[PDB]
Ligand binder design. Structure first.
Ligand SMILES: [Ca+2]
Ligand SMILES: [Ca+2]
Ligand SMILES: [Ca+2]
Ligand SMILES: [Ca+2]
Ligand SMILES: [Ca+2]
Ligand SMILES: [Ca+2]
Ligand SMILES: [Ca+2]
Ligand SMILES: [Ca+2]
Lengths: 181, 181, 178, 181, 181, 181, 181, 181
């Protein structure tokens, strides 16, 4: 099965077909893994607009989007607001707790869940989900564990790539509309 | 014929000869597709100074330069001011509305218009223009659709490349002068 | 739409749908452009096995395969014979002559012909065909002229890529065998 | 776990551990996919010496090496004789005849069988084996189907790579000895 | 000996086993060598979260992490505060003074120390330590002097690479746990 | 002769031997050509620390460093202050004026001057100096005009590279000591 | 000026404009620098067909082509015969001897001569000619010495590139025609 | 000190200054690792002529060049003949035997010997010599063990690089005169 990023297995496509919830890591997935820090305590993070468009397409194609992140920042709240992401868990080490809460609130089986991570701290959740995704430049020890490895790096369109994959699998890609913000 | 970025087709050269208006996307085209967000509500974007030089050369050589963007930020208005861009459309989901508004105000035919984009939301406009351009690292589904694909990535000199192309085709490249800002 | 080598335009896919004959340049297209010459007058040329599979797929799926070369070698006859190619023109400077001979013999319109080339001498023929193809590492001046530029280089699987494209466009890719 | 070619999944390492027979494709796997032909009818094929060493290590460390190829030439016979490969099947469209012959002769289950191929014609065999492998530069559609994809290209050491993996997983790589021929 | 970044020498793995103190450069090691400066006198630097996870792993595994910088910035104090780095030295031109100071305070022999640098100013200290490390994109002249050259660039996970190496050498990597901060 | 960035011509080394003044462009030479802008008028630019070390080595080794830039920002003054650069020209559209002034004030012949540029507006000055330099990623049309093309891209160490070259040509490289700032 | 291989300097184009004779190295220039030797005393060498087309264009556009090679083989004579090269010197250790003979025979000044080489043994002749050319993958010490360094590697179209440059400079490229042999 | 392939360590250079004997592997060192086999029992192996020039330079500069290879072919004898190599051992599985014979015959201490290899079978010999060299594309497990790793791949100029290194260290590089064969 061909995609606009390269061929994927029938098994990966079958997994993506069932996804009702896409959970995303922030650092190294939605960003390039950097943290910008200033002398007056300012903190910045870079997000990618094409990911934003992808998220918008998913959110309006009956695919819920969630975020579970180890750090905690107001800027992430602002980013979730502008994209319309209502499910946000910040400052969590053991991400299994947020994951159990998500499966509870949305009444959703783990087989209908996809997760995109970039480090070993993400694997406990990724192990349980229907479609585990590692970004192109994730930690070397995570890459072979995931169901699908993206072609695009974290913060460069890896999330858009996953969004495109889910929509294509469900026959929603051609008629998908979002906002490139 | 020969350009400093590599050979281009005669058809692309001929399209570029009639361009009286260059419409530019912002995110992914004039920038590398990143939005910097802070904890105090700050927002940054990165612009390329060699693109600035190209835009100046275009404006000072009878080629109007316009911007249509899906995002809305004051920093964009500032950047347009410093470059002497007077045509700015922000927060536009359906870019056809703004595109139609531009052509009626400037009294210019769609064939005399070039558009440089990076995502699928730009295509409805790009389809109608004389010279459609996708940046090197545009969305993979956009690339095969455009009349021309730049060698240089978004935010790295892709706009300059397009400006160089228009000027050369119009025999203005030798005499064109600008400010590297 | 989507291909295993990456996205292609609607216009290119429409062109590939109509192809009944694929004409192939040899040097730089079926080979990496190299000529091996020996002291006893030996001559070798390298061919790609995956191109072979693609040509066998096309030939058994209603797509005829032809060759027009500027060089002349017995080894090229041997290669065609093993692949079941019957239309071979060697030592052809002006490739337009061999081209007209093919359209006549097979009773085929130039719109239903694809040509894969790598140098400027191939252009007079590529201009006339429905689907012109330059290989990834073709001469720089030929590349922007073609309808489609391959992702794979000459002798590396560029021909297989084109066979894949024709069979995909014709809905034959799944069923085809080589 | 970690290999000298990069991390592999526990799944691949566990599959490699269980392997008693290694079936190898020739063209595009043991060679770089090229057929060198001459005017007098001479034919050449190129092989990699570091692959040779790996085959000698596998054969000396209780792993069988077998070849199923669609082509037929005397040179392939000669290569196998220099390596001590006793199981060779040439000129076959359907590689399932040879694969099943190899299972009855060695009394070996499909799971203890690993296959290295580079094209779609190999897939029927690889589908049924314990560890299916595709070389780095295999046909794009074959790549996502394999359990393992080699880092090294066909004819460059993709076979050595698989031999190194088979030996590592079996704890034989430390004291494995071969001849670089 | 196999790591997830590729093979390392037995001597490097032996040196890495004895490490109780890891001293790190900031600029070009924890960052990509860039200083972001503003008109109101702002200063930003970028850090890598996967480096943070590595640092947290070392500190919780009996490996002290310290920093010696030639620059002085409040932002760096903040980054150290998040990671649990208690030994910070800023504004220091001659890094030997800070180096001698650390060994005296921690009662540690130089052979039990590792240093990760990127420029020639780091060498006088690196020469003395048990394990000297130059990052992948360090100054050309520093690279051949170091015991180990990282595969990953400064600011992109070179520090995490060293942490992973130290933990594997000491048999602590499997059980090592940190926070991606 | 051999340098740590690769071989250089005998003419380039002879030209570097005579250099008493190094003139640098800012944008695309000391930076990667990006301008960061915010919604509150904030302006940011990124500088490279290893460039800073080079400039420090040059200034302390009897090579004067000057800057001529077409933009104007306070942050550039802050950078020049820290590096000890006293010759700065901002908002300079025609760079030939600042060049004439520098030769006048410092009593220096153009043959003893080096200029590092990245765009075509730099050329009128570069044409007159003893050693003209284009950065690796300078505008395509400037590259073939320059006496030397750096290996390193602008804002990534292109200036450190030129600094190393001048110091090597003059036999000051080993004696050179600066601050990594 | 712009070429299909990228920009070249005005000085390079001026040198190319005067060229009446192009002299070529064989090994590393017309070939990829390989010698194929066999057990029966067979010797092979690889030539590039697009180089042959370029050579045919040169000879038919009032540009004499000649070869000076340090080795001697009958295959080279055969190659020259197919291309119509009539000036061939083999087994040539001091290439200045053949160079003088050629210039005497054709009554041509050193300035009207171009030489394409790949190794240091070629420099004494290259130093004297109007246009000296080192191929992209020439010996690293030769590269900085040449007037022009080709973009394309030896045996891959470096000679075609030089032919293309001479024809363009002399205004003969559009109407130049050869045979792809 | 600095070389035309990049900086080497002061240790590697000091080792290179003592080298009187250069022992070379064949397959993967003087060639790219390929064995060409034919239907009528023909064998070919490709040699690099720039390597030949380097070997000629070594042999004329008080550096003996020897060969120990695991395979056995008349073509290798022919290649040694043309280069003037008289010390050739073929079909050697345990290379320590021929190594002991060499040191015995030439009356040379192992510290004054250099070995260039590409696989693990070379290591027992490399472990004993003064300068062990692994080629750029050697087996991954060999690379970290060698004193020096070449920039150039086997059969592409790796041997030339080593020759250039020995001559440079002994002050004979500009001196060096050979035949490009
Ligand atoms: Ca993460
Ligand atoms: Ca956009
Ligand atoms: Ca051709
Ligand atoms: Ca195969
Ligand atoms: Ca530093
Ligand atoms: Ca600039
Ligand atoms: Ca040569
Ligand atoms: Ca070997």
């Amino acid at each position: 099965l061909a995609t606009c990023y390269g061929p994927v297995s029938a098994d990966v496509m079958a997994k993506a077909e069932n996804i009702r919830l896409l959970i995303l890591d922030v650092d190294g997935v939605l960003s390039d893994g950097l943290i910008y820090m200033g002398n007056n305590g300012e903190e910045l993070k870079a997000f990618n607009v094409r990911d934003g468009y992808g998220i918008r397409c998913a959110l309006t194609s009956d695919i819920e989007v969630a975020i579970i992140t180890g750090r905690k920042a107001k800027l992430v709240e602002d980013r979730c607001a502008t994209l319309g992401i209502t499910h946000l868990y910040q400052g969590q080490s053991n991400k299994l707790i947020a994951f159990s809460d998500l499966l509870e609130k949305l009444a959703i089986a783990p087989e209908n869940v996809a997760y995109v991570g970039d480090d070993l701290i993400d694997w406990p959740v990724m192990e349980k989900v229907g479609l585990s995704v590692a970004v192109a430049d994730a930690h070397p020890l995570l890459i072979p564990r995931a169901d699908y490895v993206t072609r695009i790096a974290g913060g460069r369109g890896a999330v858009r790539e996953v969004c495109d994959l889910l929509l294509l699998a469900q026959g929603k890609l051609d008629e998908a509309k979002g906002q490139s913000i």
